[PDB]
Tab-separated table of C-alpha atoms and ligand atoms in Angstrom:
chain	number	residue	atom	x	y	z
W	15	UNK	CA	27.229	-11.930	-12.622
W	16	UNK	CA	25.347	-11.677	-9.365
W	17	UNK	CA	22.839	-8.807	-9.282
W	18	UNK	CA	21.942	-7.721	-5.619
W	19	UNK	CA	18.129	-6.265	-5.712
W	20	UNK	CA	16.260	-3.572	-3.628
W	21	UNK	CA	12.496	-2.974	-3.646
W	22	UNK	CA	11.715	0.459	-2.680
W	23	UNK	CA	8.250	2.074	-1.290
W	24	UNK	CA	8.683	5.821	0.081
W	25	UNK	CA	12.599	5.457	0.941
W	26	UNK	CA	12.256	1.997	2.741
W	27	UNK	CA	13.521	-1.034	1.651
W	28	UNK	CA	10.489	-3.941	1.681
W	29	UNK	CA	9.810	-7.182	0.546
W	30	UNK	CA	6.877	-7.151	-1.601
W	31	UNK	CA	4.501	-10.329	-2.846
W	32	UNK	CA	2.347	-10.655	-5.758
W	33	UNK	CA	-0.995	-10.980	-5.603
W	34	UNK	CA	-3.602	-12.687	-7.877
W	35	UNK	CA	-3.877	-9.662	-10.190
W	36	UNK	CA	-0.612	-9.222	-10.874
W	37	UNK	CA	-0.353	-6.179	-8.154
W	38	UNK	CA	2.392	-5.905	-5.503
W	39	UNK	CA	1.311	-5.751	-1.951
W	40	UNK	CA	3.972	-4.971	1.097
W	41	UNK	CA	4.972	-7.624	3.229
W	42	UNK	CA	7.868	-6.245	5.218
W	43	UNK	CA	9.882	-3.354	5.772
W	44	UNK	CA	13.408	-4.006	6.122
W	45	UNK	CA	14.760	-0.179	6.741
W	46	UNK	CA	14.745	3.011	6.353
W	47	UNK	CA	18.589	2.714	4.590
W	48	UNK	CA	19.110	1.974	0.981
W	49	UNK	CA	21.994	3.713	0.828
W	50	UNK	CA	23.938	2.145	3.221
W	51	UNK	CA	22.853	-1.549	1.997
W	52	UNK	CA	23.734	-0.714	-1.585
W	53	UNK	CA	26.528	0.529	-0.837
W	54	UNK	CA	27.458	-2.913	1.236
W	55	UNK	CA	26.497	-4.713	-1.990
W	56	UNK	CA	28.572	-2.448	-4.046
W	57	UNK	CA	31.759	-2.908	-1.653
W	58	UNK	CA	31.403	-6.511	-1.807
W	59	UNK	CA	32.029	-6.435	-5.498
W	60	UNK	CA	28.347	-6.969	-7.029
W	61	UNK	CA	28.617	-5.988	-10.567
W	62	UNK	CA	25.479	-4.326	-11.288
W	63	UNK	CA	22.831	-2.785	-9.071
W	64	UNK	CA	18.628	-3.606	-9.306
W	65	UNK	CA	16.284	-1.217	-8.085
W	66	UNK	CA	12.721	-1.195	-8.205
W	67	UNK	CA	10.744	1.980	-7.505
W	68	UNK	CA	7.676	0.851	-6.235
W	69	UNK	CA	5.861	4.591	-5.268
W	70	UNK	CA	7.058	5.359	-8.970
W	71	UNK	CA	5.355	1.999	-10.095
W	72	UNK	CA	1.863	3.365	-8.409
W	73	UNK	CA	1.688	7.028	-9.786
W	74	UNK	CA	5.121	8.158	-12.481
W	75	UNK	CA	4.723	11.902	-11.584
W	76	UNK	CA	5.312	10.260	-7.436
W	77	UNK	CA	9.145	8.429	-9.693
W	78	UNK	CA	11.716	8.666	-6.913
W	79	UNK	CA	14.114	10.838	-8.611
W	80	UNK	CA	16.190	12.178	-6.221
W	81	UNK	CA	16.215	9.262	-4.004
W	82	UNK	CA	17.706	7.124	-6.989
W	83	UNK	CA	20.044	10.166	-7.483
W	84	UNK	CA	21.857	10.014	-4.303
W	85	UNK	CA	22.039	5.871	-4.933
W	86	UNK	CA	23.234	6.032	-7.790
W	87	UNK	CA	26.269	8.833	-6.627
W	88	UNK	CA	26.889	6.222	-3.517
W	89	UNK	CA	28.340	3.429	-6.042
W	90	UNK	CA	30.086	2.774	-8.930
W	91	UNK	CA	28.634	0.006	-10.985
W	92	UNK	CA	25.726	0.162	-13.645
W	93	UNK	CA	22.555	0.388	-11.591
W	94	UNK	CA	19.439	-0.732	-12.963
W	95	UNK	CA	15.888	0.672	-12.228
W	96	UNK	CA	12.283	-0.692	-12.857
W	97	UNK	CA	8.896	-0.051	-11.344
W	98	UNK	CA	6.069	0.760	-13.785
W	99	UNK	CA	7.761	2.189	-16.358
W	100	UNK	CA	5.497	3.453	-18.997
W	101	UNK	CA	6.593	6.885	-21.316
W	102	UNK	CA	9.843	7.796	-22.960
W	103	UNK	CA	9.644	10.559	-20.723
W	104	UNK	CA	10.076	8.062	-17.650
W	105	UNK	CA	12.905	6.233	-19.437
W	106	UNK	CA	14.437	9.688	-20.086
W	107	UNK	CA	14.592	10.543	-16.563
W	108	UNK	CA	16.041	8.075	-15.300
W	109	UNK	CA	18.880	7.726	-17.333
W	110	UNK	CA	19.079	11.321	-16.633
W	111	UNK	CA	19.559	10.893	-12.982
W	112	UNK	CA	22.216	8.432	-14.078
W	113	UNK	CA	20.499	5.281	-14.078
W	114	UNK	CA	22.615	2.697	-16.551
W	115	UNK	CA	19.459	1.083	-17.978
W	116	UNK	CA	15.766	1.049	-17.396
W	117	UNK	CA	13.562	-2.032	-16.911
W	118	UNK	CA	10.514	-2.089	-18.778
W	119	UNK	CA	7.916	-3.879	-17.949
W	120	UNK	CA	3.947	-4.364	-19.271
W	121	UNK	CA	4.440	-1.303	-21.753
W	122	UNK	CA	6.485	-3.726	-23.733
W	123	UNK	CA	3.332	-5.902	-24.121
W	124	UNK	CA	0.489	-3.313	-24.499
W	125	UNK	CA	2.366	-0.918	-26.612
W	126	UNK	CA	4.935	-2.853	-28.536
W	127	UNK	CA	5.291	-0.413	-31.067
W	128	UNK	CA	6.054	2.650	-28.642
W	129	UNK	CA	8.591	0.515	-27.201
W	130	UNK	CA	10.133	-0.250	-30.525
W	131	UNK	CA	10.383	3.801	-30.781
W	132	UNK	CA	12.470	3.701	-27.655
W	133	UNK	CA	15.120	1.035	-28.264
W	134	UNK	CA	15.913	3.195	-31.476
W	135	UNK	CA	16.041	6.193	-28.981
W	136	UNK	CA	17.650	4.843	-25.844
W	137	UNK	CA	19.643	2.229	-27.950
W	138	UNK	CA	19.833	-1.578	-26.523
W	139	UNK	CA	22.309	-0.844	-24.293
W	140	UNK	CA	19.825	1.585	-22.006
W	141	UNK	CA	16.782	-1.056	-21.678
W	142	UNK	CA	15.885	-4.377	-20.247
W	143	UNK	CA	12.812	-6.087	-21.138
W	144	UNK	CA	11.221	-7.608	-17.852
W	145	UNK	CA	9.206	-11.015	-19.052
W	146	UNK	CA	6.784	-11.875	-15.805
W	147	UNK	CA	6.530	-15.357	-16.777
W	148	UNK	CA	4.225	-18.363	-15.719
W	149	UNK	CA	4.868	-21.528	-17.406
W	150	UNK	CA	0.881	-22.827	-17.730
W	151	UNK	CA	-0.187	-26.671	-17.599
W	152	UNK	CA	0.582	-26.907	-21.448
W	153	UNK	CA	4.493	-25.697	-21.306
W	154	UNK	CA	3.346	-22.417	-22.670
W	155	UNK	CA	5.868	-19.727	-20.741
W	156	UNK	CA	3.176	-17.217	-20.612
W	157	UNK	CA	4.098	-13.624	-20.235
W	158	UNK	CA	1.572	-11.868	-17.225
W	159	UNK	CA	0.569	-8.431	-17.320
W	160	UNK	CA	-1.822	-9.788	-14.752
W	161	UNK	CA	-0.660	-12.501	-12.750
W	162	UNK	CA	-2.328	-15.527	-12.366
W	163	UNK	CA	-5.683	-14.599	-13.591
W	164	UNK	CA	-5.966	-13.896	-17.307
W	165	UNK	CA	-3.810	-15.196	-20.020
W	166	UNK	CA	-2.278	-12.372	-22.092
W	167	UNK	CA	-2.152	-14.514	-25.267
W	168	UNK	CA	1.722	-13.647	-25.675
W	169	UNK	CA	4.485	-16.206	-25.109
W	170	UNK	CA	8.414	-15.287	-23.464
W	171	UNK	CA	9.379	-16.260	-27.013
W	172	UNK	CA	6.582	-14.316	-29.092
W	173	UNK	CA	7.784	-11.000	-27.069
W	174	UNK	CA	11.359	-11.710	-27.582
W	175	UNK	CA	11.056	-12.120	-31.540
W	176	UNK	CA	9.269	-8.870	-31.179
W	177	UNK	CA	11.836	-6.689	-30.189
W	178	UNK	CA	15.111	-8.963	-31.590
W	179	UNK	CA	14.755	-6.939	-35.100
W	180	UNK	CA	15.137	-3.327	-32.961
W	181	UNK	CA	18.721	-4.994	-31.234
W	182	UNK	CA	17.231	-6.428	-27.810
W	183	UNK	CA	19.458	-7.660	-25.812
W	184	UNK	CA	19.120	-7.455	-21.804
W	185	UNK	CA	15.793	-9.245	-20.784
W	186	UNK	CA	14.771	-9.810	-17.278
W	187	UNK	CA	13.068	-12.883	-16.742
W	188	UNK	CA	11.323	-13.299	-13.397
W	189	UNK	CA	9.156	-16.866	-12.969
W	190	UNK	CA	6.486	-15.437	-11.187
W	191	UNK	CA	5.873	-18.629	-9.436
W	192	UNK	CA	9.042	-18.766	-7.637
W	193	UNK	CA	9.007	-14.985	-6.980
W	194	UNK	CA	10.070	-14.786	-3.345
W	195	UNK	CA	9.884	-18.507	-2.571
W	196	UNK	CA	13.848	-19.474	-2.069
W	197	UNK	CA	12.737	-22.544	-3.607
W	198	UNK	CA	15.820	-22.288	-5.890
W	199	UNK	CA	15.534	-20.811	-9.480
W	200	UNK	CA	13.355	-22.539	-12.387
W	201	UNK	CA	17.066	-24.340	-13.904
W	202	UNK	CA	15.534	-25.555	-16.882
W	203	UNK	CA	13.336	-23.012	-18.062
W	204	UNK	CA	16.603	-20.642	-17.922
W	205	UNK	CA	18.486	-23.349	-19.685
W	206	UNK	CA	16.196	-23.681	-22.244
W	207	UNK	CA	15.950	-19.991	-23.159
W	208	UNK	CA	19.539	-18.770	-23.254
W	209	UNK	CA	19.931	-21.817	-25.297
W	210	UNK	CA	17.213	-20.727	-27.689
W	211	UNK	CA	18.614	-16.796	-27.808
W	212	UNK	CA	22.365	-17.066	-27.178
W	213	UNK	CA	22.425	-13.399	-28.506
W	214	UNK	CA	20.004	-12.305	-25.536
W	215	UNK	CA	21.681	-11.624	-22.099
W	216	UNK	CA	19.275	-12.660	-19.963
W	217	UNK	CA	19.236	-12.276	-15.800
W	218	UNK	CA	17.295	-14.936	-13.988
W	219	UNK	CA	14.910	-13.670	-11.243
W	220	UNK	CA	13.152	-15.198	-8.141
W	221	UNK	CA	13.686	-18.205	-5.829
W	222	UNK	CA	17.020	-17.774	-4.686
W	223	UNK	CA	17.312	-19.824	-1.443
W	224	UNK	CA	21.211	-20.720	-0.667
W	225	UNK	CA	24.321	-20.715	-2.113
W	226	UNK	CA	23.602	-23.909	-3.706
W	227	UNK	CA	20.704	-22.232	-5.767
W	228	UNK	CA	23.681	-19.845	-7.487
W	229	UNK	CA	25.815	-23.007	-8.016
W	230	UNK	CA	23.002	-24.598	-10.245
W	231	UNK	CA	22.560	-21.989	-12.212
W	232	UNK	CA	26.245	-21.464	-13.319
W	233	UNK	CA	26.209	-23.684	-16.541
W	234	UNK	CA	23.165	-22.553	-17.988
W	235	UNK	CA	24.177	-19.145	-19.555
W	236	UNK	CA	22.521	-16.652	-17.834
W	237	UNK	CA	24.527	-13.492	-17.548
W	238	UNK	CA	22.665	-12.295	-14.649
W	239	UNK	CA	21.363	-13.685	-11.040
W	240	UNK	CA	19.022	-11.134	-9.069
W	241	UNK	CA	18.990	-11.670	-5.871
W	242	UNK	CA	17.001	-10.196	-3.345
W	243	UNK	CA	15.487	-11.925	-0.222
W	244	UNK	CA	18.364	-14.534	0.694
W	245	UNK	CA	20.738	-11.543	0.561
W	246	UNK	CA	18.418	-9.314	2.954
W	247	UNK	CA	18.064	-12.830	4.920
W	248	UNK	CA	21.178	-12.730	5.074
W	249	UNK	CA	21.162	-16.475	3.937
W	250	UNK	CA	24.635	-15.849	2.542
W	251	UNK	CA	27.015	-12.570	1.844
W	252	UNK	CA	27.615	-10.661	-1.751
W	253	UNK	CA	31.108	-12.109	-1.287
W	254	UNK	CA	30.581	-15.471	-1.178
W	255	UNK	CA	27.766	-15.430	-3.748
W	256	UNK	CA	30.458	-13.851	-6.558
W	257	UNK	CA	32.858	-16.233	-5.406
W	258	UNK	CA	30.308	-19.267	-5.974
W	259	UNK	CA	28.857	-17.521	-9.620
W	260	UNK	CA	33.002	-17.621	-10.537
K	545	LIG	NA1	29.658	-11.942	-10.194
């Protein structure tokens, strides 16, 4: 299924790039009108919705609540929110405000054990595990909690096994260097791991470019394809994206 994507700073849509630490720096803004555009997306027929909360990212007490409210009331198909997600208070709220599942990020890493406590709150259905990965100059698909700079000393796979015994299921896995690039997706490295955990759903992330991109990824397994700067390029339509994916 094709997953249209919004970054969100303030109430404006932006494109965001990551920097050599791992942080996310602003790049441009797009508008001032999520709604609107999701609500395009959602028209069009996009199955599920990904949002990430980028002022919620920078300070959790700042989480866009009510903003993500009034999205979420505007459409009618699971919507999906990340953006520094760190408590099971955070997680809580979100799926309060009517969120369908929450994308967790670097917590997953840090704290693995916390997060283990939330799957058997939240249940598998509520989360996705986001997997920043960088495939290093010995294959190793390294997961980054900080970019391009340190290694975290925990593989894609490692982090996977971790949370498979708690029911894991949805993982989000962005290759960080294709993040933005509309190079096209990484085909193998998505082939390879829904091969290697056909019980994981997992939605492919970053590079998107054309129509052709979606077209390569179809026999590879992945359940999801986020998409977010060819669709605010407007390199191709919601429409006929869906109607390449099927
Ligand atoms: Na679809």
């Amino acid at each position: 299924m094709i997953i249209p994507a919004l970054n969100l700073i303030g109430g404006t849509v932006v494109r965001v790039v990551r920097l050599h630490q791992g942080d996310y720096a602003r790049q441009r803004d797009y508008g001032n009108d999520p709604l609107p555009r999701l609500q395009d997306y959602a028209a069009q027929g996009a199955g599920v919705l990904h949002l990430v909360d980028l002022t919620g990212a920078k300070d959790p007490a700042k989480r866009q609540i009510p903003l993500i409210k009034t999205l979420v009331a505007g459409v009618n198909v699971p919507v999906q929110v990340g953006g520094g997600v760190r408590t099971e208070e955070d997680v809580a709220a979100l799926l309060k405000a009517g969120v369908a599942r929450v994308v967790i990020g670097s917590t997953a890493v840090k704290s693995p054990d916390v997060v283990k406590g939330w799957f058997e709150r939240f249940g598998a259905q509520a989360l996705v595990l986001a997997l920043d990965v960088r495939i290093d100059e010995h294959g190793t698909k390294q997961v980054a909690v900080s970019g391009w700079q340190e290694n975290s000393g925990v593989s894609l796979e490692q982090l996977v096994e971790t949370y498979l015994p708690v029911g894991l299921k949805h993982v989000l896995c962005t290759d960080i260097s294709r993040d933005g690039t509309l190079a096209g997706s990484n085909v193998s490295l998505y082939e390879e791991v829904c091969a290697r955990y056909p019980q994981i759903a997992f939605q492919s992330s970053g590079g998107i470019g054309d129509i052709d991109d979606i077209a390569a990824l179809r026999g590879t397994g992945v359940r999801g394809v986020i998409v977010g700067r060819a669709l605010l390029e407007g390199k191709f339509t919601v429409k006929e994206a869906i109607q390449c994916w099927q």
